[PDB]
Design a protein around this ligand. Structure first.
Ligand SMILES: *[C@@H]1O[C@H](CO)[C@@H](O[C@@H]2O[C@H](CO)[C@@H](O)[C@H](O)[C@H]2NC(C)=O)[C@H](O)[C@H]1NC(C)=O
Ligand SMILES: *[C@@H]1O[C@H](CO)[C@@H](O)[C@H](O)[C@H]1NC(C)=O
Ligand SMILES: *[C@@H]1O[C@H](CO)[C@@H](O)[C@H](O)[C@H]1NC(C)=O
Ligand SMILES: *[C@@H]1O[C@H](CO)[C@@H](O)[C@H](O)[C@H]1NC(C)=O
Lengths: 216, 195, 217, 217
């Protein structure tokens, strides 16, 4: 299944407050109006980080798995929730073929729209919130960053349905409001008006003609 | 910096006397042994045959190459022959790309089928580290302290004084190594807890 | 010190199947270094069975496959034939030592199919041996199968003691083995005991072909 | 092919000293610098040493450190062994067959290029002597090759014309400090006197040839 990603997967690009500015940056973002893939079991390629979302009541997800092989003779990244704590763990794991030694690191810390983003040292963002792919705009805050680096090429979820789509290196314009929170954005390369809004650093473009770009 | 050991304390983008009143986002201490002459290839932008297959650097590096002679330690009285060069690869590594490998290089027309010979070369060979090794070909220890200096919040900080805060007067501040002069006031601005 | 201990025998009939072991420690077979084997009967060249741990060497057939993990290798034969009844060795590297490590030795075997009965006699010392004032006796247990035979022979009806020796592998055109047992005396004591005689037993055999290998005949 | 041929074997007293050698026939040694290797008699190969182009060589403490030495000369495409204080278990066949060190080279799984035909360190307080062979009047006839040195020697029947029926037991040694063995042939008993039966020993090592016709009384 393939499903619309519209106005979704924006996150705060760094640990800097910026009230009342239309800031602009090049980074790994989910492309606007592209396809998130929708699911109902499988492993997936961790192309260049992930945007994730799910919508269910009974708190159905434990956590996530990332790495090269997902089986022993290289260190692989695991995350678990056992209600009282989220756990992060990294090991040359002994995993089975259907997971519904020498560990290098460990750490501990429609009912929702369970949004999360992961990017490779390693970083995590979210907007785990009640809203009762879904429409509208919201921005993911950081959750964790881990000062570790790994050759990740595969991804999986410890379980029903969830959405997945991979970030790409793009220029964005970001509307920080009066409070330093992102509230709208322009995906530069989406269409000619979106590079026009980016060319003149604005969320409104007056009537006219504008040189936005070069062709060769 | 004060040590009587170090034969080189070369540093780039940071001075070693300023280094103790500063802070870094992380520091990576990249550690190994070489023949002492090869210190010339442990420098940013140097076109090193050993560097490109063993320990590369950025051409725009920030860090210190802290090296000492260790002949008096590592060269055993019966002769040391423990450590290995890497002599060959298909291509040059990226700025800190390690690449453990087991693969025969072919330097011409011969087929090697994963077994060595003339024109069929394995990547590694012995460092001769005799206790009698003269001067330059001795085991030299190196730590390359790589320093990251990113706009991210710092984590590896110098042993600085920690002054009391003053508000509503002009002061020459330094917070996490970020430094300037100003009137400091507590403010209403709603920083998110991660900013 | 360290050895890749190997099983002394494993067995299949002509055309059948076996898979074996060559077992060291985590300091060798687990220490990233892979394993090799050699076939070698005495005075034959050590014939290497493995290449890269992904191939066989030049001309070495498919039956000589091998498989390795944990703390052991496991070489094989499918399509066993009689010349495979031979000595073999194994090799790798050991981190507990400076250098290489070697295995305990293996004998592949064709199966013990027929109960062939031994021939039994001591080949006589001649009166011509007295040209050097001396005599010689061996008890022969030729022509049996499978495995081994009960060494039993006597002098003056008293039993011969400590005279045991190893059995010899299969003959051509058949599978039959041979074995022997040995004794010595001072030459005048060798005249003084007369009744050198064999009473050998094997799992099919009923009676001996025993003659009189006396001294001075 | 790296056709490796071993050479320069010797026999000296316990606690004596030697020099020995082996060569890659017609093929340059600088690509394929093999280490010394040997059998332990009745058991596997024993780890003697490793080698490298640069030197960096190591030996086993278990039997060969403080005694053996290793070197080569590419004008002569030959390995050498300067050796001190002989020990009895040194007595074996020696092959010069693989090159890469304790530090991994070639691949994490090796391949072994050529095992030759064997040179020998040999050790005893005996000296060269010929066997006390006689006709052993038996047919299923055989011989016992008492009291000789050194081993090995070529043993056959009718100068090799009777080889198809021949079988030889495990080797023997006597309180004299000297070797023996027994060889057997199984042939018709009724053909005696019209067919000839001879045991042959081509004894170039002892300088005492044996080629004697046998018949019983
Ligand atoms: C900045 O934060 C303030 C709260 O600290 C937001 O003001 C509230 O907004 C909600 C609706 O979003 C109203 O129901 C409240 O009555 C407001 N409270 C106050 C004290 O004004 C404000 O929305 C944020 N700024 C922007 C531009 O959205
Ligand atoms: C998603 O992918 C399909 C092909 O599977 C493509 O036709 C479509 O334009 C894409 N976009 C949306 C929003 O469906
Ligand atoms: C990363 O892992 C993949 C296998 O998933 C491998 O093909 C690739 O070569 C690895 N890259 C590096 C730099 O090791
Ligand atoms: C379960 O939760 C406790 C804290 O309540 C934590 O210490 C423990 O590590 C968790 N165990 C697992 C298996 O996640």
């Amino acid at each position: 299944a393939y499903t619309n990603s519209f106005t979704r997967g924006v996150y705060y690009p760094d640990k800097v407050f910026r009230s009342s500015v239309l800031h602009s940056t090049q980074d790994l973002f989910l492309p606007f109006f592209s396809n998130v893939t929708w699911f109902h079991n499988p492993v997936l390629p961790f192309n260049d980080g992930v945007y994730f979302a799910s919508t269910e009541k009974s708190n159905i997800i434990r956590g996530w798995i990332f790495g090269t092989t997902l089986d022993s003779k290289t260190q692989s990244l695991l995350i678990v929730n056992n209600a009282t704590n989220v756990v992060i763990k990294v090991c040359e794991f002994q995993f089975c073929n259907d997971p519904f030694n020498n560990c290098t690191f460990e750490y501990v810390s429609f009912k929702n729209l369970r949004e999360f983003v992961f990017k490779n040292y390693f970083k995590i963002y979210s907007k785990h919130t009640p809203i009762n792919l879904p429409q509208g705009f919201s921005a993911l805050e950081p959750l964790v960053d881990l000062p570790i680096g790994i050759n990740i090429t595969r991804f999986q979820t410890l379980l029903a349905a969830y959405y997945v789509g991979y970030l790409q290196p793009r220029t964005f314009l970001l509307k920080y409001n009066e409070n330093g929170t992102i509230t709208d954005a322009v995906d530069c390369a989406l269409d000619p008006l979106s590079e026009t809004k980016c060319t003149l650093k604005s969320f409104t473009v007056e009537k006219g003609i504008y040189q936005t770009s070069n062709f060769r | 910096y004060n040590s009587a050991s170090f034969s080189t304390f070369k540093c780039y983008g940071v001075s070693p006397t300023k280094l103790n009143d500063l802070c870094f986002t992380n520091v990576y201490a990249d550690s190994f042994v070489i023949r002492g002459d090869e210190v010339r290839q442990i420098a940013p932008g140097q076109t090193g045959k050993i560097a490109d297959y063993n320990y590369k650097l950025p051409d725009d590096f920030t860090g210190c190459v802290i090296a000492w002679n260790s002949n008096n330690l590592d060269s055993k009285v019966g002769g040391n022959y423990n450590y290995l060069y890497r002599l060959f690869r298909k291509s040059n590594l990226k700025p800190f790309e390690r690449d453990i490998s087991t693969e025969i290089y072919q330097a011409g027309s011969t087929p090697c089928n994963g077994v060595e010979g003339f024109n069929c070369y394995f990547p590694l060979q012995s460092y001769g580290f005799q206790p009698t090794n003269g001067v330059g070909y001795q085991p030299y220890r190196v730590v390359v302290l790589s320093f990251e200096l990113l706009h991210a919040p710092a984590t590896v900080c110098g042993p600085k004084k920690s002054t009391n805060l003053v508000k509503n007067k002009c002061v020459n501040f330094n917070f996490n190594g970020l430094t300037g002069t100003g009137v400091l006031t507590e403010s209403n601005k709603k920083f998110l807890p991660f900013q | 010190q360290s050895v890749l201990t190997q099983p002394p025998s494993v067995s299949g009939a002509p055309g059948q199947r076996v898979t074996i072991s060559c077992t060291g420690s985590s300091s060798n077979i687990g220490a990233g270094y892979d394993v090799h084997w050699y076939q070698q009967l005495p005075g034959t060249a050590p014939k290497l069975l493995i290449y890269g741990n992904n191939n066989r060497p030049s001309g070495v057939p498919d039956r000589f496959s091998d498989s390795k993990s944990g703390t052991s290798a496991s070489l094989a034969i499918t399509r066993l034939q009689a010349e495979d009844e031979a000595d073999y060795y194994c090799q790798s590297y050991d981190s507990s030592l400076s250098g290489w490590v070697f295995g305990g030795g293996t004998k592949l075997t064709v199966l013990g199919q027929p109960k062939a009965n031994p021939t039994v006699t001591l080949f006589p010392p001649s009166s011509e041996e007295l040209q050097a004032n001396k005599a010689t006796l061996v008890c022969l247990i030729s022509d049996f199968y499978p495995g081994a035979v009960t060494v039993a022979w006597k002098a003056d009806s008293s039993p011969v003691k400590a005279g045991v020796e190893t059995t010899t592998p299969s003959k051509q055109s058949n599978n039959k083995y041979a074995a022997s047992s040995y004794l010595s005396l001072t030459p005048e004591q060798w005249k003084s005991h007369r009744s050198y005689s064999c009473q050998v037993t094997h799992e099919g055999s009923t009676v001996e072909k025993t003659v009189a290998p006396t001294e001075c005949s | 092919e790296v056709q490796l041929v071993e050479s320069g074997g010797g026999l000296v007293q316990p606690g004596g000293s030697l020099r020995l050698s082996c060569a890659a026939s017609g093929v340059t040694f600088s690509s394929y610098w093999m280490s010394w290797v040997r059998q332990a008699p009745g058991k596997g190969l024993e780890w003697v040493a490793n080698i490298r182009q640069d030197g960096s060589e190591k030996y086993s403490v278990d039997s060969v450190k403080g005694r053996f030495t290793i070197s080569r000369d590419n004008a002569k495409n030959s390995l050498y062994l300067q050796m001190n204080s002989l020990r009895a278990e040194d007595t074996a066949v020696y092959y010069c067959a693989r090159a890469r060190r304790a530090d991994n080279s070639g691949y994490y799984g090796f391949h072994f290029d050529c095992w030759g035909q064997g040179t020998l360190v040999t050790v005893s307080s005996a000296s060269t002597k010929g066997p006390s062979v006689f006709p052993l009047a038996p047919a299923a006839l055989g011989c016992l090759v008492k009291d000789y040195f050194p081993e090995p020697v070529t043993v056959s029947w009718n100068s090799g014309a009777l080889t198809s029926g021949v079988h030889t037991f495990p080797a023997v040694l006597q309180s004299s400090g000297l070797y023996s063995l027994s060889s057997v042939v199984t042939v018709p008993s009724s053909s005696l006197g019209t067919q000839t039966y001879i045991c042959n020993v081509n004894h170039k090592p002892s300088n005492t040839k044996v080629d004697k016709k046998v018949e019983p009384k």
